[PDB]
Amino acid sequence: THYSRKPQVSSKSAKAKVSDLRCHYKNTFETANVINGMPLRKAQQLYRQVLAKTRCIPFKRYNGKIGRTAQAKEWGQTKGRWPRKSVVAMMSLLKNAEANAIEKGLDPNQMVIKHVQVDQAARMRRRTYRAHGRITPYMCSPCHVQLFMSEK
RNA sequence: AAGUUUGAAAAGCACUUUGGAAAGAGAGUGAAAUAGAACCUGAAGUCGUGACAAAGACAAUGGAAGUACCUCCAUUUCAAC
RNA sequence: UGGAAAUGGGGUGCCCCCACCCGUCUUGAAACACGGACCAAGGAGUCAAACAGACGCGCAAGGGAGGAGAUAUGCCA
RNA sequence: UAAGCCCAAUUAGUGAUUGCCCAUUAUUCCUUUGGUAAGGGCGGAAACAAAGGAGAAAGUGUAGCCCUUCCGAUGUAGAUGUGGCCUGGAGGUUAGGACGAAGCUUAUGGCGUGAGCCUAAGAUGGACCGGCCUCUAGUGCAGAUCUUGGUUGGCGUAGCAAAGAUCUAACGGAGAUAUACUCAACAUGCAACGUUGGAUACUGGAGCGGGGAAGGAUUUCGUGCCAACGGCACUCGUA
RNA sequence: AACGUGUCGCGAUGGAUGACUUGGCUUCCUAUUUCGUUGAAGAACGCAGUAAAGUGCGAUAAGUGGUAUCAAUUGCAGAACAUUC
RNA sequence: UUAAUGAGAUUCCCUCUGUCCCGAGUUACUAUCUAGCGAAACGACAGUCAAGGGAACGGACUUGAAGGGCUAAGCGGGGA
RNA sequence: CACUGACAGGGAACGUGAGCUGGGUUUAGACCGUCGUGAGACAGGUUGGUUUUACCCUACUUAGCUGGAAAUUGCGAGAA
Ligand SMILES: [Mg+2]
Ligand SMILES: [Mg+2]
Ligand SMILES: [Mg+2]
Ligand SMILES: [Mg+2]
Ligand SMILES: [Mg+2]
Ligand SMILES: [Mg+2]
Ligand SMILES: [Mg+2]
Ligand SMILES: [Mg+2]
Ligand SMILES: [Mg+2]
Ligand SMILES: [Mg+2]
Numbered sequence A: 001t002h003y004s005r006k007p008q009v010s011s012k013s014a015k016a017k018v019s020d021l022r023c024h025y026k027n028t029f030e031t032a033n034v035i036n037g038m039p040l041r042k043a044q045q046l047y048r049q050v051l052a053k054t055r056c057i058p059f060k061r062y063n064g065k066i067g068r069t070a071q072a073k074e075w076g077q078t079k080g081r082w083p084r085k086s087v088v089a090m091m092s093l094l095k096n097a098e099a100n101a102i103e104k105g106l107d108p109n110q111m112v113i114k115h116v117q118v119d120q121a122a123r124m125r126r127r128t129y130r131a132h133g134r135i136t137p138y139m140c141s142p143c144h145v146q147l148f149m150s151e152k
Numbered sequence B: 001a002a003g004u005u006u007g008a009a010a011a012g013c014a015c016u017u018u019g020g021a022a023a024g025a026g027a028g029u030g031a032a033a034u035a036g037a038a039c040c041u042g043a044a045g046u047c048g049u050g051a052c053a054a055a056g057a058c059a060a061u062g063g064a065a066g067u068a069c070c071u072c073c074a075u076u077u078c079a080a081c
Numbered sequence C: 001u002g003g004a005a006a007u008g009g010g011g012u013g014c015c016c017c018c019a020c021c022c023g024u025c026u027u028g029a030a031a032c033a034c035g036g037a038c039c040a041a042g043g044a045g046u047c048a049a050a051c052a053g054a055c056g057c058g059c060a061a062g063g064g065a066g067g068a069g070a071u072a073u074g075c076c077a
Numbered sequence D: 001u002a003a004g005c006c007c008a009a010u011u012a013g014u015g016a017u018u019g020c021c022c023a024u025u026a027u028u029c030c031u032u033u034g035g036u037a038a039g040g041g042c043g044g045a046a047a048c049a050a051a052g053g054a055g056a057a058a059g060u061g062u063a064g065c066c067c068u069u070c071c072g073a074u075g076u077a078g079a080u081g082u083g084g085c086c087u088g089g090a091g092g093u094u095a096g097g098a099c100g101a102a103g104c105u106u107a108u109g110g111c112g113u114g115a116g117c118c119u120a121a122g123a124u125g126g127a128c129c130g131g132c133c134u135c136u137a138g139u140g141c142a143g144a145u146c147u148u149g150g151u152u153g154g155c156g157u158a159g160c161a162a163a164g165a166u167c168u169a170a171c172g173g174a175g176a177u178a179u180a181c182u183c184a185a186c187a188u189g190c191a192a193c194g195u196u197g198g199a200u201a202c203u204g205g206a207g208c209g210g211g212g213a214a215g216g217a218u219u220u221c222g223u224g225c226c227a228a229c230g231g232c233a234c235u236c237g238u239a
Numbered sequence E: 001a002a003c004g005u006g007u008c009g010c011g012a013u014g015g016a017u018g019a020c021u022u023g024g025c026u027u028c029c030u031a032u033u034u035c036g037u038u039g040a041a042g043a044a045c046g047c048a049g050u051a052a053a054g055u056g057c058g059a060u061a062a063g064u065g066g067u068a069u070c071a072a073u074u075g076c077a078g079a080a081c082a083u084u085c
Numbered sequence F: 001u002u003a004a005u006g007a008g009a010u011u012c013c014c015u016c017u018g019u020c021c022c023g024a025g026u027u028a029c030u031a032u033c034u035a036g037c038g039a040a041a042c043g044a045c046a047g048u049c050a051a052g053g054g055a056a057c058g059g060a061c062u063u064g065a066a067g068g069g070c071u072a073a074g075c076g077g078g079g080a
Numbered sequence G: 001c002a003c004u005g006a007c008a009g010g011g012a013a014c015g016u017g018a019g020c021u022g023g024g025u026u027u028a029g030a031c032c033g034u035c036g037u038g039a040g041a042c043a044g045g046u047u048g049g050u051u052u053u054a055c056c057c058u059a060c061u062u063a064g065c066u067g068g069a070a071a072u073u074g075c076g077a078g079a080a
């Protein structure tokens, strides 16, 4: 078993995924979730504008004590950020899904994202040095991402 | 500390395509890939996603008796019965 | 004789009423007394010897070995 | 003109006797369980094919041999009983399994006061194992500042602030000038890297100069490479 | 509205359980059974076509000689008395 | 008892001043916002008050008074 | 000792140490007196002697977003 959900019509759908991405899971969770119901072209425009810092990514769940901004009002929030490392990773994933649709013989201008899921992957371990001769964990948290889109 | 315990047999994924690569989407081997490499089974705890139920502020949990809605459950009945 | 009715179970919400946090020492705990983030696996009246009582079994003015030997026996501690 | 205090009533000089509300108490009915428990039955009366039915054990304890009757029932420390429940192995006996064993999952119901037992489904698994009578033991977990492994809120938070510092163009590189429509360009690909040439600074001869001992032992050099490591980054490196 | 709560289907992280066992522990028996200056036990360094560890071996170095057997060893090279060189 | 000496203990005087009357203004690095990276302590469950009684100082109990939800920067009354 | 209208008395864990300070009291060094054979003692004197942590909940101070009268539902209807 691969994907937690199944497209309505398989012959008019494209899929993509990536494992052990080495981006912060909490940052990638917010970046991927905002495009869940959007058309493919509209999702790609949003990521370009986030890199230009004219629009932001809303942080809805993992947002404890982050800054407030005026660009979060269009999402009905007050807190948002511009995580560039997560954005460029999601840009590559959309290109792969677009390539799969063209190979099948579909129109990328008529595709709508219908499924986005981000999960925690296995962690990697480093160490840090504290006062009074203590050693304490210094961990990294990568993530898995999967998605598919369907033609309207 | 640590069973290299995949599979009967490596037959360990030729080839197309997107990517700098890692990899993804197809195709194929095999009874099984939900057996893809330290790979039999794969629990608890924790997390993501979809559908649904609602819900002020009485921390939450709990008892007793009803009601609204649901029920991949059980049993009974279907003709001067 | 059906995508049937009915009666019991099961699930979630709601209403009226009821309802102090577990384990422990202590005369007295809910306590401003101590141990208490979650789960899996592990974790504590045992073996031997002397004595006594209750109960079961064999024999009885007798009861019973132990060590050892002998041959079925050269499969059989 | 009490909903206060002291007396006194029960529908009021009309006719005689109990105004009303609330218990794990009292009376009564149903069911369970145990007795210093109390009784009865247990020689199969006779007769009876489908197309009135079953049962009837001489019995401590059961799915209690059956029926009738009476009484008691809470409890820390503690004692005892249970044809009382559950786990690993042994002697017997009786079954199951590739038409799918063990294990695992549950808005799968049924049974039992309960410990628990059994069935259903798996769109799970792939080779062993259940019941009954005896025997045996390293035989049942919620907590011991318990042991070992894993996870987790705090949390994208505290912070990554001594030693003054970099700027520019051109090469290199996948690391860019990366767009669906509209459209001239900005308002839709950001940030970051090595080398060379310029510019600007620092060390300031008790030097981030050039050589040795102790200690280290290939860290030296060239080419390549960027999975992990250099707590930011790398096309670079004592990797 | 959002955050948050609850139940169900699916998926992650994690490595428990079951089945398996060339290992351990314990109890018995047999005998022409007990090392070294004729240099032992232990320590070091080396040896393969390819060879880091481990195993075996010692410049005759993953081994020479003899007896028995009877066609392999194998990741890839290489070699090729069968009457048994 | 003692000249010289003392990061030794003590009292007064001159000079001096933000020690104070009584505070005000400026600078570098922080805190604060962003990109990358990323912990610990602690953690029964939780978290609005007044009086009452109670192991004689309650977040939970009795009777009253408050209380729409979610958040950013600070603070040091309580969490005996 | 002065000024003034006057220089009243008390509580708040003998209010207030993750607010400060550390002079006193009360470790380890050392001197004196008295006591003890002695090691040592003295609510007797003297000198020198580390003051740790907030990023959690609440309270308080400011600073933002946002539903809602059956206080999220009923279609359950009330106009100062
Ligand atoms: Mg902060
Ligand atoms: Mg440090
Ligand atoms: Mg399998
Ligand atoms: Mg597996
Ligand atoms: Mg799980
Ligand atoms: Mg209670
Ligand atoms: Mg006491
Ligand atoms: Mg108690
Ligand atoms: Mg108290
Ligand atoms: Mg104690």
Ligand SMILES: [Mg+2]
Residues within 6 Å of the ligand: none
């Ligand atoms: Mg005799």
Ligand SMILES: [Mg+2]
Residues within 6 Å of the ligand: none
């Ligand atoms: Mg009775």
Ligand SMILES: [Mg+2]
Residues within 6 Å of the ligand: none
């Ligand atoms: Mg009793």
Ligand SMILES: [Mg+2]
Residues within 6 Å of the ligand: D088
């Ligand atoms: Mg055992």
Ligand SMILES: [Mg+2]
Residues within 6 Å of the ligand: none
């Ligand atoms: Mg459940």
Ligand SMILES: [Mg+2]
Residues within 6 Å of the ligand: D138
């Ligand atoms: Mg035990």
Ligand SMILES: [Mg+2]
Residues within 6 Å of the ligand: none
């Ligand atoms: Mg356990």
Ligand SMILES: [Mg+2]
Residues within 6 Å of the ligand: none
């Ligand atoms: Mg920060």
Ligand SMILES: [Mg+2]
Residues within 6 Å of the ligand: D161
């Ligand atoms: Mg900084």
Ligand SMILES: [Mg+2]
Residues within 6 Å of the ligand: D161
């Ligand atoms: Mg600092």
Ligand SMILES: [Mg+2]
Residues within 6 Å of the ligand: none
């Ligand atoms: Mg500096």
Ligand SMILES: [Mg+2]
Residues within 6 Å of the ligand: none
């Ligand atoms: Mg650029």
Ligand SMILES: [Mg+2]
Residues within 6 Å of the ligand: none
């Ligand atoms: Mg330059």
Ligand SMILES: [Mg+2]
Residues within 6 Å of the ligand: D207, D209
């Ligand atoms: Mg020098």
Ligand SMILES: [Mg+2]
Residues within 6 Å of the ligand: none
């Ligand atoms: Mg780094």
Ligand SMILES: [Mg+2]
Residues within 6 Å of the ligand: none
């Ligand atoms: Mg020689």
